[PDB]
Amino acid sequence: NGPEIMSKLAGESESNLRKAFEEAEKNAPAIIFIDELDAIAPKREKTHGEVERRIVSQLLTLMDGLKQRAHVIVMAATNRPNSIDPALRRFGRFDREVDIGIPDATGRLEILQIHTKNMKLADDVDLEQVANETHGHVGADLAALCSEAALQAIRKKMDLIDLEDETIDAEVMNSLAVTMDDFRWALSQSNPSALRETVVEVPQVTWEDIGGLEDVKRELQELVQYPVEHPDKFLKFGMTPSKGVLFYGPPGCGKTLLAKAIANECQAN
Amino acid sequence: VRAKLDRQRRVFQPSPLASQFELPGDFFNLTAEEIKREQRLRSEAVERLSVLRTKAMREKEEQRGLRKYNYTLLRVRLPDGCLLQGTF
Numbered sequence: 146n147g148p149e150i151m152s153k154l155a156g157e158s159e160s161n162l163r164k165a166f167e168e169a170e171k172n173a174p175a176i177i178f179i180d181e182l183d184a185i186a187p188k189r190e191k192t193h194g195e196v197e198r199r200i201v202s203q204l205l206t207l208m209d210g211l212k213q214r215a216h217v218i219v220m221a222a223t224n225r226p227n228s229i230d231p232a233l234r235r236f237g238r239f240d241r242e243v244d245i246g247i248p249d250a251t252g253r254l255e256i257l258q259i260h261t262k263n264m265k266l267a268d269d270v271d272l273e274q275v276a277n278e279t280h281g282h283v284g285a286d287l288a289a290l291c292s293e294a295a296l297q298a299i300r301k302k303m304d305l306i307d308l309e310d311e312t313i314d315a316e317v318m319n320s321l322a323v324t325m326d327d328f329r330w331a332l333s334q335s336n337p338s339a340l341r342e343t344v345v346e347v348p349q350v351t352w353e354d355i356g357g358l359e360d361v362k363r364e365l366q367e368l369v370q371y372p373v374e375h376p377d378k379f380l381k382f383g384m385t386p387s388k389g390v391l392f393y394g395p396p397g398c399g400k401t402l403l404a405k406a407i408a409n410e411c412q413a414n
Numbered sequence: 415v416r417a418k419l420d421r422q423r424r425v426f427q428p429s430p431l432a433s434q435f436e437l438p439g440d441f442f443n444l445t446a447e448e449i450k451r452e453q454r455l456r457s458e459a460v461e462r463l464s465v466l467r468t469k470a471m472r473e474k475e476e477q478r479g480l481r482k483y484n485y486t487l488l489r490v491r492l493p494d495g496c497l498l499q500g501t502f
């Protein structure tokens with residue numbers, strides 16, 4: 146992790162970073178994970194400190210040495226893809242990138258189900274309703290949400306039953322169910338850690354949500370679906386599909402729903 | 415026509431034996447009932463101050479505790495050690 150390597154003195158941060166790569170080779174196959182990549186290897190042209198520029202050169206050479214260190218893969222995490230020195234992105238080194246982003250409503254429900262595997266839920270619990278309300282939340286927040294719901298259910302029942310000892314009866318714990326009221330309370334305490342970042346997901350607006358505009362609905366299908374549903378007809382006539390359409394007219398007539406509804410039927414983000 | 419309130423005058427002599435009571439060693443070990451009750455009251459004290467509500471909702475909570483009494487029993491502590499009681 147960046148902060149730990151940066152806490153080391155000049156000469157120690159470079160040696161310690163190299164040792165990590167040497168140990169991974171000795172234990173190969175191995176995976177090296179570098180957290181806060183933007184902290185360990187910030188853009189060199191942005192930092193005047195000699196040590197912070199040096200550690201970038203040291204990481205770049207260690208990454209290149211992976212052609213000799215057999216069966217070692219280096220993974221890294223950053224909060225922003227543009228906060229790291231672009232040299233790392235050259236062929237080799239970090240030439241694969243995956244955008245994790247923010248889970249959508251379906252992903253949020255899956256996370257809630259995962260962190261409740263061991264939890265007994267009451268019949269009134271509706272995790273889909275929770276996932277729909279938790280806008281702007283990420284897995285760390287949904288995990289905390291389940292934890293807080295567990296603690297509230299435990300305080301209501303178990304604190305009246307449990308002993309001042311190291312162990313608790315298995316029957317008492319197994320007989321505790323977490324109700325929807327405990328999730329609602331936990332939702333009031335939780336605060337999303339990623340509310341401002343743009344969320345990209347398949348919209349839930351369908352054609353049934355739009356009154357009228359029967360011809361516009363068909364026009365969007367011709368512009369968006371036909372180029373990929375019938376590509377042989379576009380090639381046959383030498384046509385280049387349109388790249389987009391502009392809507393104009395009075396406000397409040399459904400322009401937003403039209404764009405979402407076509408994305409919905411196409412299952413597009 | 416209304417009945418007159420009878421003072422029911424009584425005088426008592428306290429006995430030194432009334433204050434002689436020794437606790438068991440386990441008296442000061444808090445129970446699960448006390449831990450769950452007190453932990454609930456701590457959360458309710460924070461929630462009560464945190465809730466946004468009009469005066470009518472505040473009156474509904476306070477009003478339930480206000481109406482029980484319309485008589486009083488008075489005592490007077492006299493220099494000679496006698497306890498004088500009556501009804502008003």
Ligand SMILES: Nc1ncnc2c1ncn2[C@@H]1O[C@H](COP(=O)(O)OP(=O)(O)O)[C@@H](O)[C@H]1O
Pocket residue numbers: 354355356357358395396397398399400401402
């Ligand atoms: N054709 C329509 N069918 C159903 N609802 C509509 C229609 N046109 C507008 N609305 C309602 O009006 C609101 C505003 O639509 P929107 O396209 O967002 O307008 P604007 O983008 O100008 O603010 C929507 O929330 C929708 O509920």
